[PDB]
Amino acid sequence: QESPAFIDPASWNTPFNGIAQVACHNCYEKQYANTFSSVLDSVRTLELDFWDQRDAVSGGSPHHWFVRHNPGSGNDNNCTKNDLEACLNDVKNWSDKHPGHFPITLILDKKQGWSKESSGRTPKDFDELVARVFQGKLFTPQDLATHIGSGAGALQGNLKGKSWPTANDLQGKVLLVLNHSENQKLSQYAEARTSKAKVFISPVTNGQNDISGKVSGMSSQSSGYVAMNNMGKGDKSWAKQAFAYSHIGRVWGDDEVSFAQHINQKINLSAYYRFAAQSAGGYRIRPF
Ligand SMILES: [Ca+2]
Numbered sequence: 001q002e003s004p005a006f007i008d009p010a011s012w013n014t015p016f017n018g019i020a021q022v023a024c025h026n027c028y029e030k031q032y033a034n035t036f037s038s039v040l041d042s043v044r045t046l047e048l049d050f051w052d053q054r055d056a057v058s059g060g061s062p063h064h065w066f067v068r069h070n071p072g073s074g075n076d077n078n079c080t081k082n083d084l085e086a087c088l089n090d091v092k093n094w095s096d097k098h099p100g101h102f103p104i105t106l107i108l109d110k111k112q113g114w115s116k117e118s119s120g121r122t123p124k125d126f127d128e129l130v131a132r133v134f135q136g137k138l139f140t141p142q143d144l145a146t147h148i149g150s151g152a153g154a155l156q157g158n159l160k161g162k163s164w165p166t167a168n169d170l171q172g173k174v175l176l177v178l179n180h181s182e183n184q185k186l187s188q189y190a191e192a193r194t195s196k197a198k199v200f201i202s203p204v205t206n207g208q209n210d211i212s213g214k215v216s217g218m219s220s221q222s223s224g225y226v227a228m229n230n231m232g233k234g235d236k237s238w239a240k241q242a243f244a245y246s247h248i249g250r251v252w253g254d255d256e257v258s259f260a261q262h263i264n265q266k267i268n269l270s271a272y273y274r275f276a277a278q279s280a281g282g283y284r285i286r287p288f
Contacts, residue, residue, distance in 0.1 A: 001100045001171060006042065006279070008286035015163035016103065016170060017246045020263045021045050022284040023107070025252055025271040028067055028077040028087060032273055036079040037090045040104070042276045043284055045269050046091065047107040048077075050084045052121050062120020063129060071111075088133045095137055095174060102285065103139065103170035105269065107250065108199065109179040114188055123192035130176055130198050139165075139173040141225055142195050152195040153224040157212060159246040177202050177250075179230050183210075183217030190222035202228035202250065206235045211245050239267040243288075263288055 001012060011019050023045035026032060033039045039046050050065040055072035065084035068076035079087035091104060115121035131138065142152045147165055150158035176199040178186055186201040193199075203215045203226060210216055215223040229242040233253040242249030243266035250269035251262065260280040262270040266288065272278050280286065 001168065002098060002102060004041075005282065006284040007044075007102055008281075008283040010287050011102070011285050012168045013166055014287045015166055015246075017159075017164045017243070017248060017268065018287055019167060020259075020267065020286055020288050021105075021269050022259050022275050022278045023047070023105070023250065023269040023271045024275045025255075025273045026069065027275065028079065029069055030076070030078045032275075033078055035090075036077065036087055037094050039275070040091075040094050040098075044102045045105040045107065045271075047109060047271070048084065048087050049109045049111055052112040052115060060115075060119065060121065063125055065121065065129075085129060085133060088130065091174065092133050092137065095172065100171050102167055103173040103175060105175045105177060105248075107177045107179055107202075107269075107271075110185060111180075113185060114192075123189045126189075127193060127196070127198040134174050134176075137172065137174045138198055139170060139175050141197050141200055141227060144227060145195070152197070153221065156224045156226045156245075156247075159227055160212075160244065162246050164246065164248075175200065177228055177248075179204075183215055187215075187218035187222040190225045191219065194225075197225070200228045200248075201225055202230040202248070205229040205231050205238045205242070205249075207238075208241060211238065211241045211247060236265060236267065239265055242266075242268070259284070 027039045028048050053060045054074050066075050067084050067087050075082045079090050145152040148162040178199045178201050183203040214220045228248040231251045236251045239249040248268045251267045252271040259278045
């Protein structure tokens with residue numbers, strides 16, 4: 001079991017959903033970290049923005065995605081061709097070098113739509129990439145479902161009143177999370193992959209239905225897989241309901257509010273551009 005100073009030792013025996021973290025915001029950008037791997041000197045939750053095309057309209061290849069902030073171009077990031085796969089391998093390699101690590105959560109913020117089969121960037125192609133890179137390191141929705149005695153398609157509601165595995169249980173694990181501006185893209189992913197999904201969907205959340213009902217922009221069937229919720233600053237009040245439902249809540253854009261205050265607001269993952277500057281009682285990871 002690792003013991004960097006930033007992790008409160010009480011975290012290890014706490015269910016993952018009962019742990020608050022400082023997360024990065026867009027830490028693949030050169031301006032926020034010198035290398036992507038260096039982010040793991042400070043936090044255990046990272047973020048990658050990924051594009052199908054080299055710009056908005058051209059330059060994609062099968063089984064490949066780019067990492068950059070703007071529509072464009074190409075790859076513009078601090079990973080070790082520094083594409084999505086390369087960025088993911090930086091995490092995989094850090095994980096191999098730190099047996100016993102606190103579970104790593106990677107927010108995969110998708111910037112374009114899914115392709116059809118011919119172009120090699122479907123939900124299935126995405127799952128195949130992340131599985132090829134991480135292999136057995138992943139902890140997936142079905143793994144959580146089995147832990148709580150639920151079908152994966154009923155995580156949404158069956159998580160209420162339940163504990164995730166503890167950080168100790170999740171030593172050495174990687175959790176992948178899908179974001180997009182449009183919940184439709186998450187619904188498409190879940191409809192394609194169902195219980196085989198390698199990635200947790202985390203919809204944009206601005207009402208109770210996005211936690212526990214038919215999520216805005218999604219089918220009822222896809223809604224049932226929701227075990228995580230994504231909130232901008234204006235919607236962070238919903239983190240208390242994510243918490244109530246044992247969904248992992250992430251709040252982005254709220255940098256002028258301290259980690260301690262976010263803990264009090266029941267936010268699991270508080271995303272900061274300046275992640276190293278944040279702490280509470282010397283810690284960046286602690287139980288609520
Ligand atoms: Ca992002």
